[PDB]
C-alpha cells in the first residue's frame, strides 16, 4: 500500500477501507466518521465536474473557439438573465434528487436513478479509477486557470511554448517564480520534517 | 462548585446555618467547644457563594470560608 | 589511545569504538549515544561533501576553467539557476529521504536502497578511520579555500604557488595588511 | 519584482474583510459549541 | 453537556453559561492554572509561545517594509526628505465618496494613501535603504525569518526536541550567551553594517550584496586595526558642508566621536553611532564571560548572592536563598524583565526626541511627537505589568520558609512603613502642586499675573549648566572655559556637543522655567501615586488586616463579600486595576507637557508656553482648545479634507471612553436581573422561541466587568490623544 | 469635582480600608492613632459620594459655561 | 610603537601574574564558588588551557588598549 511519500504513516483514521487511500490528512479534517463520507462524495463530484470541464476546455482550444475565460462575454442565441433562471431552476430539482440518493445509498446518482449505469460496468476498480482521474482533473483545472492567470493564451499553447525552451520556459522563470520555488523547497523538506518527529 | 470549609475555631453559635439561603450548612455534634456543636457543609453542590455565612460568623478570624470555584446552573443561581 | 591534549584523559562518553575517536570533545556535544551516533553520521556526510567539493575545486583549477570556483554560480548555463534549484531540491529530497530512512533501519550510510552501499567489498575499520580523517582534512581545507579567496582573491593552487615563490611574504600577514593593494 | 497587480487591493481587501472573517467566525462558533463525547 | 472549549480547563468546560467563552479566552495564556500542568510542560509551552511571538513580530516588520516598497514614495522621499511627506500604504475603501478620494490623494501618489507617522522612512534612509528593491528584499528576508521562527516553535513541542526542565534553569549559560552573543555579537554585526553599508551609502557610494566584497570601508584596509593604530580610523571625518547621500563634503573616517548633530540632517553622525555600537559590542562580549558554565572559570550567581550580606545585620540574612526564589519563579523573572524594559522604553523616548539618530527626523514634527507618545505609553503599560507580576509572584511563588530573614522577607516585614511614606509623598506633592496651580489660576483670573508663585527650577538649570549650557550663567564644569572637565574633552567630543546644546532650535536640553518646574512636580506626583497603588497591592497581596488569608484566594478574585464592612476591590488585581488609571493620567501629563513645549518651540514662540504653562486655564485654552480647531474641522457641513479621519477617530475614542464608563460605574446585579427579564421575553415569544441559545445568557462577572471597562477606557484614551496629536501637529506643519 | 467623582465610582472600599490600615500603622508608631477607628466609606456611601460629585461637577460645568457665554454675548 | 612587542609583553605579563601571583587566589575563589570536562594538564601548578585563554585574553585586551591610547597621540 503506497503512501503519499516514501515512508508515511496513516493518521489512525485512513487505514485503507476507502479507495485511493494514501494516508494524506495533515489538517485531520476527516477525523469524524460522518464527515468522511460527505467529504468523499464532495471529492467525487468535484472530480467529475473538473473532468468534464477540463475535457471541454481542451476541446475548445483545438478547434479554435474562444478561450474558456472569455466564452462568457461572447453573445449567444439567448439572454443571460434567462440562462441563470433556467440553470438554477433545473439544478434545484437535480441537486435535490441527487442529495436524496446519497441519504438512501451513499453514492452519486442521476435524477431518480441512484446507481446510474445503463451499460453496467460498475466495478470496484472502476470506482477507484474515477477518483484518480477526478483528482488529476482537479489539478489540471487549477493548472489551466493558473496558466491563464500569468501567461494567458491557453493550455495547449502553454504546452507548445514549454516545448520551445523547457529549460527557460517554466513556472520558475515566470512572474510567480520565487514563490513557487520556495514552496517547492519547503514541500521537499516536509517529508523529512514529518519523519524527524513522528 | 464553590468550596465551603469549616475550621476548628467554630463556637457552634449556629448563626451561619440560619443565614444560609440555600441550605448548605448544618450542625453536627462536637466536643471542641462549650456549645458541643460544629458547623458542617454536606450540600456544597447547592452553594451559590453569597458569603452570608461569613457575614454571620462572629469568630476572629472567620470559622467558615467560601472559595468561589467552578460555576454551574446551581452555583450561578439561575432559574432558567 | 592518544588524545588531542597531552596529559588529558579522554571523556567517559567518548570511547575508542568509533572510527576517528581521539577523545576530542571540550564542549561535550556527544554525551548521549543517540546524539553521538547521529553526529557521527553527520560528520561522515559533511566530510564526504567537503571531499567532493575540494576535489571539484582542485579539478576545476587544474583543468583551466575560465571562472574561479567562487564565480561558477553566476556563469551562464543552459537551464538557468532559477530553474536548477527546484530540480535539485526534488531529487535531493528523494535521495536524502531514502538515505535517512535507510539510516533508521540500520546505523550505516547508503545509496537509495543499498544499505550499506558497498560494492566490490574493500571495507574495514581502518578504512573507516581513513574516511573520517580525510573528511576532517577536506572540511578544514574547504574553509581554508573560502577564507583564502576572501582575503587574497587567489585560487588554491594559485595561492599555493604564490606562497612557494616567496615564502617570507605573501602570507596571512602580508595579505591581511596589504588589503587595499589586493583589491 | 514582488509588485502585486493593480487589482490586488480590490480582491484582497474584500476577502480579508468579509470572506475570511465569516469563515473564521463560523468555524470558531462551531468549535466553541461542540459537545465533548 | 461538557463542551470541548476550553480544553485546558475542565471546570470551565462544564460551565453552561456564556461565561465559559469569556473565561476560556481570558485564561488561555495562564498556563500555571491549566489542568494537569507540570513545570517542564510549562517551560516548554512558554518556549513555543516565545517563538510564535518572534514570528509575529518579524511578519509585522516584513509587512511594513512590503507596503512602503509597494504603495509608498520612498524613492521620491530620499530625493527631497524635507518637503515630501512619507506614505504609509494605499487606501482601498468602497465607502469613500468622491471628495474623500481626492482628499486622501496626496503625497504624489496616484490614489488615496496614508501619511506615515512611524518614522520608518528616516530610519531606513539612515541605515542605507535607497530604492524600493532594497525594501522588497528586506521584506522577503524577514518573512522567511518569521516562517523559520514559527517552524522552530512548532518543532520544539514534538518529541526528541522538547527541552528538559534542567536546560531551562541553566541561568549562567543563558546569561553568558545573551550578554556575549545576543547583545555583543549582534552589536558587532550592526557595527559591521554601519561601517560597510550605512556610512558608504551616506557618502554617495552604493554598497550592496553585489559589491560589498570588493569595496573597502576604509582606504587603509584593516591594517590599522591589526597594528593597533586605531586612531587612523578617525582621520578625515565628514565636514560641516557634507550633503547626506552624496559625496560632496564627505570624509573617509569610519569610527569617530565628534558628538553633536549633523549640520544638515540634524541627527547623530553615522561614524559616531558605528563607534558606539563597536564599544558596547566589546563591553557586552567581555561581560559575557562572567559566569561559570563548563570550564571551571567564572562565577556562580548563588555564591555571589550568598556572599553579599552586611556584617552588622542591617539587611538581615542579606540575599541568602534569593537565587532559588528567582530561578524557580517565572513571575519574579517576568517582573524584573518588564521593569527593566519599561525603564529602557522611557529612556528610548527621551533620548530619541532629544538626540535624534535618524536623518531628517527632527524636522518631521508629527513623527517625533507620535514616537515619543507611543514609547511613553508602552513604557507605562509595561511598568504596570511589572508590578502586577510582582504581586503574582508574592501570591503564587513566594515561600517565607525559603526566604527567611533575607531582604525579600524584610520588605514585607515593614510594608506598612513603605506604603505610609508613599502615601505621604503623594499627598504632599498633590496638595502643593494643585495649590500652586489654583493660586496661579486665581491670580490670572483676578488680573494680577505678577502675584502668582513662580518657583525657578534652579536644580535642573544647574544640571543644564553642568552640561555646558551658558544661558543661566552658572559657569562651572562644562560651562566654564577653565575647568579640567572642559579642557579634557575639547579635542574629542565637547565642541560638537557644546554647539548642539547651546543651540535653542533643537530639543537638546530645552530651556526650562517655572512652568517646567510645576509640570515636573505633577509628573512626580503621578509616578509616586502609581507606585503607591502598585506597591501597596503587591505587598498586601498575601493578606492584610481586612483579609488575613488573601493568598488563599489567588491573585484575582471578585471580592470577599459585603461582610466586615465591605470588601470591594480588595484583591491585588484590583490594585493593578486602579493603578492603570493613574498610569494613563501620568503618561497623559508627560505627553501633554512634551507636545505643548514642542508645539510652542516649532511655532517659534516659546514665550507662549513659558507664560501659559503656569496656570491650568492656559493649558486648557492655549493648548487643548486652540490646537483642536483644525481637528474638529476635518469634516463640516461645507465639505471635508484629509484630516477628517482624525476627527472621526477623535469622536471614536470619546465614544469608547464613555462606553467604558458604563462597565466602570454600573455593576453586575442590575444587568443580571435585566438579562433574566430578557430570557423570559425570548422564551415567551412565538416564532422566536424555536431558536434557542446553546449557552445560558448571564451578565459579565465583576472581574470581567472591570477588565472590559478598563480596556474601553484605555482604548478611548489612546485613540483620542493619538488623533488629536497627529491632527494638530500635521495640520499646523 | 466631576473627575474627583471617578475615584469613588470606579474603586472599592477594600483597597481604601487596607490603605487606611497602613496609615493607621504610621499613626500608631507616633502615638497619634485616634480612639475612633478610621474606616473607609461604605459601598453605598462610596456610590453616593461618587454620584453626588458627578452631578455637582457636571451641572456646575454647564452652569459656568452657560452663564459666562450668555452674559458675554447676550 | 611596535605592536608585536606591546602585545607580546602584555600577554606574557598577564600570564606570569596569572601563573605565579593570582593562581592560588583564583583557585581558592573557584573552589569556594560552589556535566563538565576535566582539562587535566601536566603543569605542576594546575595552570590549564582555560586559564591560559583567560589570562591571554586579559593581556590582549590590555595590550590593545595601550596601543590604541598611544595611537591617539595623547
Ligand atoms: C551548496 C553550497 C554553495 C556554496 C558554498 C556557494 C557559494 C557561493 N555561491 Mg552559490 N554556492 C553554493 C551553491 C549554489 N549556488 C548556486 C547558484 C549561485 C548563483 C546564481 C550565484 C552563486 C554565488 C555564490 C557566491 C556568493 C558569495 C558572496 O557573498 O558573493 C557576493 C558576490 C559579490 C560581492 C560579487 C563578486 C565579487 C568577487 C569578484 C570578489 C571575491 C568574492 C569572494 C572570493 C567570495 C568568497 C565566498 C566564500 C565566503 C564562500 C559563493 C562563492 C554568486 C556568485 O558566484 O557571485 C560571483 C552568484 O551569483 N551561487 C546554486 C544553484 C542553484 C547552488 C546549489 O545548487
Ligand atoms: C562537490 C560537488 C560539485 C559541485 C556542486 C560542482 C559544481 C559545478 N561544477 Mg564540478 N566537479 C566536481 C564536483 C562538483 N562540481 C568533481 C568531484 C570534479 C572532478 C575533479 C568536478 C569537475 C568539474 C569540471 C571539469 C567542471 C566542473 C564544472 C562545474 C560547474 C558547472 C557544471 C555543471 O553543473 O554542469 C552540468 C552537470 C552535468 C552535466 C552532470 C558547477 C558550478 C565546470 C566549471 O568549472 O564551470 C565553470 C567544469 O568545467 N566540475
Ligand atoms: C502583519 C503585517 C501586515 C499588515 C498589518 C498588513 C495590512 C494590510 N495589508 Mg498586507 N501583506 C503583508 C503583511 C501585512 N499586511 C505581507 C507580508 C504581504 C506579502 C505577502 C502582504 C501583501 C498584501 C497585499 C497583496 C495586499 C495587502 C493589503 C493590506 C491592507 C488591507 C487589509 C488586508 O489585510 O489585506 C490582506 C493581506 C494579506 C493577504 C497578507 C497576509 C499574508 C500573511 C503571510 C498572512 C498573515 C497571517 C496573520 C499574521 C495571522 C493573524 C490574522 C488573524 C488570524 C488573527 C492592510 C492595510 C491589500 C492592500 O494593499 O490594500 C490597499 C493588498 O492588496 N497586503
Ligand atoms: C472590512 C470589509 C468590508 C468591505 C469590503 C465592505 C464593502 C461594502 N460595503 Mg460594508 N461594512 C463593513 C465592512 C465592509 N464593507 C462593516 C464592518 C460594517 C459595519 C460597520 C459595514 C457596514 C456597511 C453598510 C451599512 C453598508 C455597507 C455597504 C458596502 C458596499 C458598498 C456599496 C457600494 O457602493 O458598492 C455597490 C454595491 C453593489 C454593486 C451590490 C453588491 C452586493 C454584494 C456586496 C455582492 C454579492 C454578495 C456576495 C456574493 C456574498 C458575500 C458574502 C460573503 C461574506 C460570504 C460594499 C461592497 C453598503 C451596501 O451594502 O450597499 C447596499 C451599505 O449600505 N457596509
Ligand atoms: C549566542 C547564543 C544565543 C542567541 C543569539 C540567543 C538568542 C535568543 N534567545 Mg537564547 N539561549 C541560549 C543562547 C542564545 N540565545 C542558550 C545557550 C540557552 C540555554 C541556557 C538559551 C535559552 C533561551 C531561552 C529559554 C529563551 C531564549 C530566547 C532567545 C530569544 C530572545 C528573544 C528576544 O528577546 O529578542 C532579541 C533581544 C535582543 C536582540 C536584545 C535587545 C537589546 C535591548 C533590549 C534593545 C536595544 C537594542 C536597540 C536600541 C533597539 C533596536 C532599534 C531598532 C532596530 C528598532 C533570542 C533570539 C527566548 C526564546 O525562546 O525566544 C524564542 C527564550 O525563551 N534562549
Ligand atoms: C512580557 C509581557 C507579559 C507576559 C508574558 C504576561 C503574561 C501573563 N500575564 Mg500579564 N501583564 C503585562 C505583561 C505580560 N503578561 C502587562 C504589560 C500588563 C499591564 C497591562 C499585565 C497585567 C496583567 C494582569 C492584571 C494579569 C496578567 C496575567 C498574566 C498571565 C495570564 C493571563 C493571560 O495572558 O491570559 C490572556 C490575556 C488576555 C485575553 C488579554 C485580554 C485582551 C486585552 C484586554 C487587550 C484588549 C485590547 C483591545 C482588543 C484593543 C482593541 C482596539 C481596537 C478594536 C480599536 C500570564 C502568565 C493575569 C494572571 O496572572 O492571572 C492571575 C492577570 O490577572 N497580566
Ligand atoms: C481629579 C480626580 C482625582 C483626584 C483629585 C484624585 C486625588 C487623589 N487620589 Mg485618586 N483616582 C482617581 C481620580 C482622582 N484622584 C481615579 C479616576 C482613580 C481610578 C479609580 C483614582 C484612584 C486612586 C487610587 C487607587 C489612589 C488614589 C489616591 C489619591 C490621593 C493622592 C494623594 C494626593 O495627591 O494628595 C492631594 C489631595 C488632593 C488632590 C485632593 C484634593 C484636595 C481638595 C481640593 C482640598 C479641599 C478643598 C477645600 C479646602 C474644602 C472643600 C470641601 C467643601 C465641601 C467645603 C488624592 C487625594 C491614592 C491615595 O489615596 O494616596 C494616599 C490612592 O491610592 N486615587
Ligand atoms: C457613550 C457610552 C455609552 C453607550 C454607547 C451606552 C449604550 C447603552 N446603554 Mg449605557 N451607560 C453609560 C454609557 C453608555 N451606554 C454609562 C457611563 C452608564 C453609567 C451611569 C450607563 C448605564 C446604563 C444603564 C443603567 C442602562 C444602559 C443601557 C444602554 C443600552 C441602551 C439601548 C440602546 O441605546 O440601544 C442602542 C445602542 C446604542 C445607541 C449604542 C451605540 C450603538 C451604535 C450606534 C451602533 C453601531 C453598530 C455597528 C454596525 C456595529 C458594528 C461593529 C463591527 C466591528 C462589526 C445601550 C447599548 C440600558 C439598557 O440596558 O438597555 C435597555 C440600561 O438600563 N446604560
Ligand atoms: C514588586 C516586586 C518586584 C519589584 C519590582 C520593581 C523593583 C520595580 C521598580 C523600579 C524601577 C523602574 C527602578 C529603576 C531604577 C533605577 C535606578 C536605581 C537607577 C539609577 C541611576 C544612576 C546610578 C545613575 C547615575 C548617573 C547619573 C546620575 C547620570 C549620568 C550617568 C551616571 C551613571 C553617572 C519583583 C518583580 C522584582 C519581584 C518581587 C515583587
Ligand atoms: C532550516 C530548518 C528547516 C529545514 C529542515 C530540514 C529538515 C530537518 C528535519 C528536522 C530536524 C531533524 O534533526 C535531527 O533529526 C534526527 C532524526 O530524527 C535526530 O536524530 C534522532 O535519530 C537518531 C538516529 O539514530 C538517534 O540516534 C537520535 O538519538 C535521535 O535524536 C537528531 O537528533 C536531529 O538533529
Ligand atoms: C477615596 C475613597 C475612599 C476614602 C475616603 C475617605 C476615607 C473619606 C475622607 C473624608 C474625610 C477627609 C475624612 C476625615 C474627616 C474629618 C472630620 C476631617 C477633619 C479635618 C479637619 C481639618 C476638620 C473610600 O472610602 C471609598 C469607599 C468606597 C468606594 C470608593 C472609595 C474612595 O474612592
Ligand atoms: S457562624 Fe461561625 S462560629 Fe457560628 S456555627 Fe457557623 S462557623 Fe461556627
Ligand atoms: Ca544600495
Phi-psi region of C23 (alpha: psi -120 to 50; beta: other; left: phi over 0): left
Quote the CA–CA distance of E91 and E93 in Å, as a whole number: 6
Q: Which residues of chain B make contact with E549, given a CB cutoff of 8 A?
A: 61, 65
Long-range contacts of A8-16 (CB under 8 A, 24+ apart): A8/A191, A8/A194, A9/A198
Quote the CA–CA distance of C176 and C182 in Å, as a whole number: 10
User: DSSP for chain A?
Assistant: ---SSTT----SS-SS-STT-----SS-TT-SHHHHHHHHHHHHHHHHHHHHHHHHHHHHHHHTPPPTTTTTTS--SS-HHHHHHHHHHHHHHHHHHHHHHHHHTSS--BTTBSS--SS----HHHHHHHHHHHHHHHHHHHHHHHHHHHT-S-HHHHHHHHHH-TTTSSSTTSTTHHHHHHHHHHHHHHHHHHHHH-
DSSP H or E stretch at residue E635: strand E635-636
Cell numbers describing residue A66 = 474562444
CB E18 within 8 A of CB E695: yes
CB B73 within 8 A of CB E16: yes
C172 touches chain E (CB under 8 A): no
Q: Which residues of chain E make contact with B76, given a CB cutoff of 8 A?
A: 17, 698
Taking an 8 Å cut-off on Cβ atoms, the answer to whether G74 and E491 are in contact is: yes
Quote the CA–CA distance of A185 and E499 in Å, as a whole number: 57
Å between E284 CA and nearest CA of chain G: 14
User: DSSP for E154-172?
Assistant: HHTTSTTSPPPHHHHT-HH
Note down the domain range covering C76. Answer: 33-182
Residue B24 buriedness (CB in 10 A; 0-12 / 13-18 / 19+): buried
Q: Which residues of E638-669 are buried (b: 16+ CB within 10 A; e: fewer)?
A: eebbbbbbbbebbebbeebbebbbebbbebee
Strand partners, E639: E636
> Which distant-in-sequence residues (6+ apart) come within 8 Å of E389 by Cβ?
E331, E334, E335, E338
The answer to whether position C9 is within a domain reads no
CATH number of the domain where residue C82 is located: 1.10.3460.10
Elucidation technique = cryo-EM
Nearest chain D residue to E16 by CA: give it.
D33
Look-up of cell digits 442590575? E670
Looking at residue D5, the DSSP 8-state letter turns out to be: P
Q: How many helices (H) and strands (E) does chain G have?
A: 3, 0
Cell numbers describing residue G25 = 587566589
Q: Which residues of chain E make contact with C179, given a CB cutoff of 8 A?
A: 216, 221-223
Phi and psi torsions of A78, nearest 5°:
-165, 180
Quote the CA–CA distance of E199 and E218 in Å, as a whole number: 10
Q: Which chains would you list as touching D if contact means 3+ CB atom pairs under 8 Å?
A: E
Å between E194 CA and nearest CA of chain G: 21
Phi and psi torsions of E565, nearest 5°:
95, -20
Q: Which residues of chain E make contact with G33, given a CB cutoff of 8 A?
A: 292, 298-300, 303
Look-up of cell digits 558554565? E293
> Which distant-in-sequence residues (6+ apart) come within 8 Å of E308 by Cβ?
E318, E319
Note down the domain range covering B38. Answer: 1-80
Strand partners, B66: B4
| Candidates E3, E136, E695; nearest CB to D34 | E3
C70 CA to centre of ligand 1 in angstroms: 5
Strand partners, B29: B37
CA-nearest of B1, B7, B18, B24 to B60 is B7
DSSP H or E stretch at residue B38: strand B37-40
E297 CA to centre of ligand 9 in angstroms: 30
Residue E89 near ligand 3, beta carbon < 6 Å: yes
3-class SS at E191?
A: helix
Q: Whose CA is nearest to atom 23 of ligand 6?
A: E385
Total domains, chain B:
1
Taking an 8 Å cut-off on Cβ atoms, the answer to whether G41 and C26 are in contact is: no
Look-up of cell digits 527546484? C86
Strand partners, C111: C114
- Return the half-sphere exposure (C-beta side, CA atoms, 13 A cut-off) of residue A29: 7
Q: Do chains A and E touch (3 or more CB pairs under 8 A)?
A: yes
A28 CA to centre of ligand 12 in angstroms: 56
Amino acid at each position: 500500500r503506497p503512501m503519499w511519500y516514501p515512508g508515511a504513516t496513516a493518521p489512525a483514521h485512513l487505514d485503507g477501507s476507502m479507495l485511493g487511500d494514501y494516508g494524506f490528512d495533515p489538517l485531520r479534517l476527516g477525523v469524524n466518521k460522518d464527515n468522511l463520507k460527505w467529504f468523499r462524495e464532495a471529492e467525487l463530484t468535484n472530480g467529475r465536474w473538473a473532468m468534464a470541464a477540463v475535457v471541454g476546455i481542451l476541446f475548445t482550444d483545438a478547434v479554435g473557439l474562444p478561450k474558456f475565460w472569455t466564452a462568457g462575454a461572447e453573445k449567444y442565441a439567448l439572454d443571460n438573465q434567462t440562462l441563470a433562471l433556467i440553470e438554477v431552476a433545473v439544478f434545484a430539482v437535480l441537486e435535490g434528487k441527487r442529495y436524496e440518493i446519497y441519504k438512501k445509498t451513499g453514492e452519486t446518482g442521476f435524477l431518480s436513478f441512484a446507481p446510474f449505469d445503463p451499460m453496467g460496468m460498475k466495478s470496484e476498480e472502476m470506482k477507484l479509477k474515477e477518483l484518480k482521474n477526478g483528482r488529476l482533473a482537479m489539478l489540471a483545472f487549477l493548472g489551466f486557470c493558473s496558466q491563464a492567470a500569468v501567461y494567458g493564451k491557453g493550455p495547449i499553447e502553454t504546452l507548445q511554448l514549454h516545448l520551445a525552451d523547457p529549460g527557460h520556459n517554466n513556472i520558475y522563470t515566470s512572474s510567480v517564480g520565487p514563490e513557487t520555488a520556495v514552496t517547492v523547497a519547503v514541500l521537499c523538506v516536509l517529508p523529512m520534517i514529518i519523519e524527524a518527529t513522528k | 462548585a464553590h468550596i465551603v470549609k469549616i475550621y476548628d475555631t467554630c463556637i457552634g453559635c449556629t448563626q451561619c446555618v440560619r443565614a444560609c439561603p440555600l441550605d448548605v450548612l448544618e450542625m453536627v455534634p462536637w466536643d471542641g467547644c462549650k456549645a458541643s456543636q460544629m458547623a458542617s457543609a454536606p450540600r456544597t453542590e447547592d452553594c451559590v457563594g453569597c458569603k452570608r455565612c461569613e457575614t454571620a460568623c462572629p469568630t476572629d478570624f472567620l470559622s467558615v470560608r467560601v472559595y468561589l470555584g467552578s460555576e454551574s446552573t446551581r452555583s450561578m443561581g439561575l432559574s432558567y | 589511545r592518544p588524545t588531542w591534549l597531552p596529559g588529558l584523559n579522554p571523556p567517559a562518553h567518548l570511547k575508542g569504538a568509533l572510527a576517528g575517536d581521539n577523545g576530542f570533545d571540550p564542549l561535550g556535544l556527544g554525551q548521549d549515544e543517540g546524539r553521538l551516533k547521529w553526529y557521527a553520521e553527520a560528520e561522515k556526510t559533511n566530510g564526504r561533501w567537503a571531499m567532493m567539493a575540494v576535489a571539484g575545486i582542485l579539478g576545476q583549477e587544474l583543468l583551466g576553467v575560465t571562472p574561479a570556483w567562487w564565480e561558477a554560480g553566476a556563469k551562464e548555463y543552459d537551464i538557468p539557476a532559477q530553474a536548477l534549484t527546484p530540480i535539485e531540491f526534488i531529487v535531493m529530497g528523494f535521495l536524502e529521504i531514502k538515505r535517512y530512512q535507510g539510516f533508521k533501519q540500520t546505523g550505516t550510510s547508503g545509496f537509495i536502497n543499498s544499505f550499506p552501499f558497498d560494492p566490490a567489498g574493500m571495507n574495514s575499520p581502518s578504512m573507516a578511520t581513513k574516511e573520517v580523517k580525510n573528511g576532517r582534512l577536506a572540511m578544514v581545507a574547504f574553509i581554508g579555500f573560502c577564507v583564502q579567496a576572501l582575503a587574497t582573491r587567489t585560487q588554491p593552487i594559485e595561492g599555493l604557488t604564490a606562497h612557494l615563490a616567496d615564502p617570507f611574504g605573501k602570507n596571512i600577514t602580508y595579505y591581511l595588511t596589504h588589503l587595499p593593494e589586493t583589491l | 519584482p514582488f509588485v502585486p497587480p493593480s487589482w490586488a487591493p480590490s480582491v484582497f481587501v474584500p476577502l480579508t474583510g468579509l470572506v475570511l472573517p465569516a469563515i473564521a467566525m463560523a468555524t470558531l462558533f462551531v468549535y466553541i459549541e461542540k459537545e465533548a463525547p | 453537556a461538557t463542551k470541548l472549549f476550553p480544553k485546558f480547563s475542565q471546570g470551565l468546560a462544564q460551565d453552561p453559561t456564556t461565561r465559559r467563552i469569556w473565561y476560556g479566552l481570558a485564561m488561555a495564556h495562564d498556563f500555571e492554572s491549566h489542568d494537569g500542568m507540570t513545570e517542564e510542560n510549562l517551560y516548554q509551552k512558554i518556549f513555543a509561545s516565545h517563538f510564535g511571538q518572534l514570528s509575529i513580530i518579524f511578519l509585522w516588520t516584513s509587512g511594513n517594509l512590503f507596503h512602503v516598497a509597494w504603495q509608498g514614495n520612498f524613492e521620491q522621499w530620499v530625493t527631497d526628505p524635507v518637503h515630501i511627506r512619507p506614505i504609509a500604504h494605499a487606501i482601498w475603501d468602497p465607502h469613500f465618496g468622491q471628495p474623500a478620494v481626492e482628499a486622501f490623494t496626496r503625497g504624489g501618489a496616484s490614489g488615496p494613501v496614508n501619511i506615515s507617522t512611524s518614522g520608518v522612512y528616516q530610519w531606513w534612509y539612515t541605515i542605507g535603504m535607497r530604492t524600493n528593491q532594497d525594501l522588497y528584499v528586506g521584506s522577503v528576508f524577514l518573512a522567511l525569518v518569521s516562517a523559520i521562527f514559527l517552524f522552530a516553535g512548532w518543532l520544539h513541542l514534538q518529541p526528541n526536541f522538547q527541552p528538559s526542565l534542567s536546560w531551562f534553569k541553566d541561568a549562567e549559560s543563558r546569561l553568558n550567551h545573551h550578554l556575549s552573543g545576543l547583545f555583543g555579537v549582534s552589536s558587532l554585526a550592526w557595527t559591521g553594517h554601519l561601517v560597510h553599508v550605512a556610512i558608504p551609502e551616506s557618502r554617495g557610494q552604493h554598497v550592496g550584496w553585489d559589491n560589498f566584497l570588493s569595496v573597502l570601508p576604509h582606504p587603509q584596509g584593516l591594517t590599522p586595526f591589526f597594528t593597533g593604530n586605531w586612531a587612523a580610523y578617525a582621520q578625515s571625518p565628514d565636514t560641516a558642508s557634507h550633503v547626506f547621500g552624496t559625496a560632496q563634503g564627505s570624509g573617509q573616517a569610519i569610527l569617530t566621536f565628534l558628538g553633536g548633530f549633523h549640520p544638515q540632517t540634524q541627527s547623530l553622525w553615522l561614524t559616531d553611532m558605528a563607534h558606539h555600537h563597536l564599544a558596547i559590542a566589546v563591553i557586552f562580549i567581555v561581560a559575557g564571560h562572567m559566569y561559570r558554565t563548563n570550564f571551571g572559570i567564572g562565577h556562580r550567581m548563588q555564591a555571589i548572592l550568598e556572599a553579599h550580606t552586611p556584617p552588622s545585620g542591617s539587611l538581615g540574612a542579606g540575599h541568602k536563598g534569593l537565587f532559588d526564589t528567582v530561578n524557580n519563579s517565572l513571575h519574579f523573572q517576568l517582573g524584573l524583565a518588564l521593569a527593566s524594559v519599561g525603564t529602557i522604553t522611557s529612556l528610548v523616548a527621551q533620548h530619541m526626541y532629544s538626540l535624534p539618530p535618524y536623518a531628517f527626523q527632527a524636522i518631521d514634527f508629527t513623527t517625533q511627537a507620535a514616537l515619543y507618545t507611543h514609547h511613553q505609553y508602552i513604557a507605562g503599560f509595561i511598568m504596570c505589568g511589572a508590578f502586577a507580576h510582582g504581586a503574582i509572584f508574592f501570591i503564587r511563588d513566594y515561600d517565607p520558609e525559603q526566604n527567611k530573614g533575607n531582604v525579600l522577607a524584610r520588605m514585607l516585614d515593614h510594608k506598612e512603613a513603605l506604603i505610609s511614606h508613599l502615601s505621604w509623598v503623594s499627598l504632599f506633592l498633590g496638595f502643593h502642586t494643585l495649590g500652586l496651580y489654583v493660586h496661579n489660576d486665581v491670580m490670572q483670573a483676578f488680573g494680577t499675573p505678577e502675584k502668582q508663585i513662580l518657583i525657578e527650577p534652579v536644580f535642573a538649570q544647574w544640571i543644564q549648566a553642568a552640561h555646558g549650557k551658558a544661558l543661566y550663567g552658572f559657569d562651572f564644569l562644562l560651562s566654564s572655559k577653565t575647568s579640567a572637565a572642559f579642557a579634557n574633552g575639547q579635542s574629542l567630543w565637547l565642541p560638537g556637543w557644546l554647539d548642539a546644546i547651546n543651540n535653542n532650535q533643537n530639543s537638546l536640553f530645552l530651556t526650562i522655567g517655572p512652568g517646567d518646574f510645576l509640570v515636573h512636580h505633577a509628573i512626580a506626583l503621578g509616578l509616586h501615586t502609581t507606585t503607591l497603588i502598585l506597591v501597596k497591592g503587591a505587598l498586601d497581596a498575601r493578606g492584610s488586616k481586612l483579609m488575613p488569608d488573601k493568598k488563599d484566594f489567588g491573585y484575582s478574585f471578585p471580592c470577599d463579600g459585603p461582610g466586615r464592612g465591605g470588601t470591594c476591590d480588595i484583591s491585588a488585581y484590583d490594585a493593578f486595576y486602579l493603578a492603570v488609571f493613574w498610569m494613563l493620567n501620568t503618561i497623559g501629563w508627560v505627553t501633554f507637557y512634551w507636545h505643548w513645549k514642542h508645539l510652542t518651540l516649532w511655532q517659534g514662540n516659546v514665550a507662549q508656553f513659558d507664560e501659559s504653562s503656569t496656570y491650568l486655564m492656559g493649558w486648557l485654552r492655549d493648548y487643548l482648545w486652540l490646537n483642536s480647531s483644525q481637528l474638529i474641522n476635518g469634516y463640516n457641513p461645507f465639505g471635508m479634507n484629509s484630516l477628517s479621519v482624525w476627527a472621526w477617530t477623535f469622536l471614536f475614542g470619546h465614544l469608547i471612553y464613555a462606553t467604558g464608563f458604563m462597565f466602570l460605574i454600573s455593576w453586575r446585579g442590575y444587568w443580571q436581573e435585566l438579562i433574566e427579564t430578557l430570557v423570559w421575553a425570548h422564551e415567551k415569544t412565538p416564532l422566536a422561541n424555536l431558536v434557542y441559545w446553546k449557552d445560558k445568557p448571564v451578565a459579565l462577572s465583576i472581574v470581567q466587568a472591570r477588565l472590559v471597562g478598563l480596556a474601553h477606557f484605555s482604548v478611548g484614551y489612546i485613540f483620542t490623544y493619538a488623533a488629536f496629536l497627529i491632527a494638530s501637529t500635521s495640520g499646523r506643519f | 469635582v466631576w473627575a474627583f467623582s471617578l475615584m469613588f465610582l470606579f474603586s472599592g472600599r477594600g483597597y481604601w480600608q487596607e490603605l487606611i490600615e497602613s496609615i493607621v500603622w504610621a499613626h500608631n508608631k507616633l502615638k497619634v492613632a485616634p480612639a475612633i477607628q478610621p474606616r473607609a466609606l461604605s459601598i453605598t456611601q462610596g456610590r453616593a459620594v461618587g454620584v453626588a460629585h458627578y452631578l455637582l461637577g457636571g451641572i456646575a460645568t454647564t452652569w459656568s459655561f452657560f452663564l459666562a457665554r450668555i452674559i458675554s454675548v447676550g | 610603537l611596535d605592536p608585536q612587542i606591546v602585545i607580546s609583553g602584555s600577554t606574557a605579563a598577564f600570564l606570569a601574574i596569572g601563573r605565579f601571583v593570582f593562581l592560588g587566589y583564583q583557585r581558592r575563589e573557584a573552589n569556594f564558588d560552589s556535566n563538565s570536562t576535566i582539562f587535566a594538564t601536566n603543569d605542576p601548578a594546575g595552570f590549564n588551557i582555560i586559564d591560559v585563554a583567560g589570562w591571554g585574553a586579559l593581556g590582549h585586551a590590555v595590550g590593545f588598549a595601550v596601543l590604541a591610547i598611544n595611537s591617539l597621540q595623547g
